[PDB]
Amino acid sequence: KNPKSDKFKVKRFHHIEFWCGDATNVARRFSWGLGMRFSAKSDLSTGNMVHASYLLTSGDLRFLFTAPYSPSLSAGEIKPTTTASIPSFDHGSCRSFFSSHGLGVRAVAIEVEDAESAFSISVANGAIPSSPPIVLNEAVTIAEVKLYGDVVLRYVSYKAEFLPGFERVEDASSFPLDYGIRRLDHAVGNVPELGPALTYVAGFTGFHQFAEFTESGLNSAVLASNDEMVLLPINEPVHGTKRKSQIQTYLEHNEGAGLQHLALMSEDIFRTLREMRKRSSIGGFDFMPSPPPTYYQNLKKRVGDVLSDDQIKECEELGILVDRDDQGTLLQIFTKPLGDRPTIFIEIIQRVGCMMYQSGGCGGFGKGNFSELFKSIEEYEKTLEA
């Protein structure tokens, strides 16, 4: 059931901002590995003496990569005179975030009708303020509240081209890469305590519970906006298992709560994964180990109604996982961690079904692949021995 209790008008995911040590190298790596175009910049060449910010896009997906310059460049500036294009930016907060967590997501940004009212309403309803509403060039309003750990939920609203102060990138340096990724489907946080985290976030957004889950080492629940196009799962560790909780491992290496994974919807997951896997060992992203043949043998029985034998064979070539709800079918695969620490990673997704446009969350988040993978693995060792 959907109570449509959003406390303000939320539209869609707008962008994800990574806080980096060197935004140039991370952005160029991500661009090649994921097939995202360099679309805009704000840096020394645009008059920004405070931070370097580079924007990559693929369809509606926007990845922002930001790093600080030497504070000495802007020592005579004050906030009213700043050259920063993102006025919430702070040298000290960025260096401390990166020193503490390594490469990771600082901001999950959603587009709202009015960022000033979204901020006021959120804070009125328990949100911890992070950056007050600031109007950029009389055109865009941005505001930030704490989401979990040092991750902020960023509100952006447009009177009506990413942000004022950003410039479109010289087309020679903007190669039209595209591997099929089109938008952000969901963004997942890891926290030490799910209950309080859910209460806090649902408390100030009015987002409703979309789904929930739980021998796995985690509990999770999904918060969703009114039309369920903004999906925010949150995980907590479950202690006392044979294997150490993967969520606990995250918290230890991340020094606490933070963003765990970004799920990127592809319009053609076969082509996305072919293109990404071709580049894994030449600067791109690695993928988790593939399921055994027994997993794909059991897929025929599970989704032979949705996917032909040839489409299943292509899933097996690419390592793709498949889960199915009572409403839709889900194709998914996970990258290895994006950087040095075993913390943040990316998920590639495509959903089948729930046509009306496709409704958000169609097919769930893969809750059935725990059971299937474990059963798959038991049955594969059996064939190997036998």
Ligand X SMILES: CC(=O)C1=C(O)C=C2Oc3c(C(C)=O)c(O)c(C)c(O)c3[C@@]2(C)C1=O
Annotated binding site for Fe cation: 186, 261, 347
Q: Which of residues 155-194 bind ligand X (CB under 6 A)?
A: 186, 188
User: Which does residue 218 touch among Co ion, its own copies, ligand X, none (CB within 5 to 8 A, set by kind)?
Assistant: ligand X
Q: Which of residues 133-162 bind its own copies (CB under 8 A)?
A: none
Whole-number minimum distance, CB 292 to ligand X, in Å?
16
347 in contact with ligand X (CB under 6 A):
yes
Q: Are the C-beta atoms of residues 325 and 341 closer than 8 Å to each other?
A: no
Q: Which of residues 196-215 bind ligand X (CB under 6 A)?
A: 213-214
Whole-number minimum distance, CB 199 to Co ion, in Å?
22
Parallel/antiparallel/unpaired status of strands 345-353 and 328-334: antiparallel
Binding site for Co ion (CB under 5 A): 263, 347, 365
319 in contact with ligand X (CB under 6 A):
no
User: Which does residue 131 touch among Co ion, its own copies, ligand X, none (CB within 5 to 8 A, set by kind)?
Assistant: none
Considering only 6, 31, 162, 197, the residue that binds its own copies (CB under 8 A) is 31
Candidate segments 150-158, 283-291, 315-323, 370-378, binder of its own copies by CB under 8 A: 283-291
Whole-number minimum distance, CB 242 to ligand X, in Å?
14
Considering only 40, 55, 64, 67, the residue that binds its own copies (CB under 8 A) is 67
Whole-number minimum distance, CB 104 to its own copies, in Å?
10
Candidate segments 238-246, 259-267, 277-285, 358-366, binder of its own copies by CB under 8 A: 277-285
Residue number with the shortest CB distance to Co ion?
Answer: 263
366 in contact with ligand X (CB under 6 A):
yes
- 3-class secondary structure per residue, the chain: CCCCCCCCCEEEEEEEEEECCCHHHHHHHHHHHHCCEEEEEECHHHCCCCEEEEEEEECCEEEEEEEECCHHHHCCCCHHHCCCCCCCCCHHHHHHHHHHHCCEEEEEEEEECCHHHHHHHHHHCCCCEEEEEEEECCCEEEEEEEEECCEEEEEEEECCCCCCCCEECCHHHCCCCCCCEEEEEEEEEECCCHHHHHHHHHHHHCCEEEEEECCCCEEEEEEECCCCCCEEEEEEECCCCCCCCHHHHHHHHHCCCEEEEEEEEECCHHHHHHHHHHCCCCCCCCECCCCCHHHHHHHHHHHCCCCCHHHHHHHHHHCCEEEECCCEEEEEEEECCCCCCCCCEEEEEEEEECECCECCCCCCCCCHHHHHHHHHHHHHHHHHHC
Whole-number minimum distance, CB 334 to its own copies, in Å?
17
Site size for ligand X, by CB under 6 A? Answer: 14
Q: Which of residues 175-194 bind its own copies (CB under 8 A)?
A: 175, 177
Whole-number minimum distance, CB 176 to its own copies, in Å?
10
Whole-number minimum distance, CB 248 to its own copies, in Å?
13
Nearest to 355 by CA among 327, 321, 324: 327
Q: Which residues bind ligand X (CB under 6 A)?
A: 186, 188, 213-214, 216, 218, 220, 233, 347, 365-367, 369-370
Q: Which residues bind its own copies (CB under 8 A)?
A: 20-26, 28-33, 38, 43-44, 52, 67, 69-70, 72-73, 95, 98-100, 102-103, 172-175, 177, 252-255, 280-284, 286, 338-342
